[PDB]
Design a binder for this molecule. Structure first.
Ligand SMILES: [Gd]
Ligand SMILES: [Gd]
Length: 327
């Protein structure tokens, strides 16, 4: 599924473009009434859904995500969010949701239909085939909604790990096996990594990982126990960090050894993307409530799609046993 994975990197960059546009454009930045965040959430997920169906017919129906494909505007009208095929038709759809705000509608349509040619040269070398009939996909369009809206571009990271800020925002795309429930592929995209103070332009970073039939490949990792917990965490060296996807990326990058979440408020789309990348590095995610009584998280069966009993994300099972000993 390397050919699919290479495509999922493009759309994540396309998604990150939408994220970066909705904060750097004047009209989009200004935006039961008008809810721009859900609009931006649905739009990103639809872009992913349509682009994949376009490249791989049949994949459209297998793509699942955090948000619905439907919105309710200020008039109360329910709009099915289907874009294109032409750029002109997408403007008509968005103006319905945006009450008629044509400057904002055209601003989005240009970004949505904008071509992007993102390709890791290392992945072109790889030739793996996965039956399209066994793949399901969990999408989290923009994770860490609260941090994205506030938009703190000035936070100082506490020993590599940001407590908050736009760095905690991630685009999360995860592919899994329908029959078994094991995650196979994962794409994590930070739309906001490093901003130039003078130009105000943000630069992002894309992370990928594939684990299929014993073959484990992942993206090159930049160089440089540590536990990361969320801001609301209330269960007894620990760091507070915002974003479900982010804290998982902190275990991937090696900035943290353990990511523990006790509550039942994360879902399949919050963890699928990261799980697969961790899996390719010889790690994973285990049900916290089960470990307190190693069972991995499944993504095919429901409970509904919440990870009930929390999770412990680990990069090394040896590190996990060391943490399981102390606690
Ligand atoms: Gd959402
Ligand atoms: Gd989320």
């Amino acid at each position: 599924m390397s050919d699919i994975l290479q495509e999922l990197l493009r759309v994540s960059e396309k998604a990150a473009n939408i994220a970066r546009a909705c904060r750097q454009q004047e009209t989009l930045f200004q935006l039961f009434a008008v809810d721009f965040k859900t609009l931006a959430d649905v739009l990103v997920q639809e872009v992913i859904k349509e682009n994949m169906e376009n490249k791989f017919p049949g994949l459209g129906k297998k793509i699942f995500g955090e948000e619905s494909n439907e919105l309710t505007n200020d008039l109360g009208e329910k709009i099915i969010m289907r874009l294109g095929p032409t750029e002109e038709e997408t403007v008509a759809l968005l103006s319905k949701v945006l009450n008629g705000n044509k400057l904002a509608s055209e601003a989005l349509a240009k970004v949505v239909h904008q071509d992007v040619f993102f390709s890791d040269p290392a992945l072109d070398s790889v030739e793996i085939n996965i039956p399209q009939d066994i793949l399901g996909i969990w999408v989290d369009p923009i994770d860490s909604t609260y941090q994205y809206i506030k938009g703190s571009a000035d936070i100082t990271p506490n020993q590599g790990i940001f407590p908050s800020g736009l760095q905690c925002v991630t685009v999360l795309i995860g592919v899994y096996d329908i029959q078994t429930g094991v995650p196979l592929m994962g794409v994590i995209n930070q739309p906001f990594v490093s901003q130039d103070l003078h130009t105000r332009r943000w630069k992002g970073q894309c992370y990928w990982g594939l684990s299929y039939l014993g073959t484990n490949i992942h993206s090159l990792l930049p160089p440089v126990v540590v536990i990361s917990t969320s801001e609301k965490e209330t269960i007894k060296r620990i760091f507070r960090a915002a974003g479900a996807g982010y804290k998982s990326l902190c275990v991937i990058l090696g900035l943290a050894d353990i990511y523990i979440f006790s509550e039942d408020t994360t879902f399949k789309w919050d963890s699928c993307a990261a799980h697969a990348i961790l899996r390719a590095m010889g790690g994973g995610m285990v049900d916290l409530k089960e470990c307190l009584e190693l069972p991995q998280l499944v993504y095919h069966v429901g409970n509904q799609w919440a990870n009930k009993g929390g999770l412990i994300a680990y990069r090394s099972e040896k590190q996990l046993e060391t943490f399981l000993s102390r606690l």
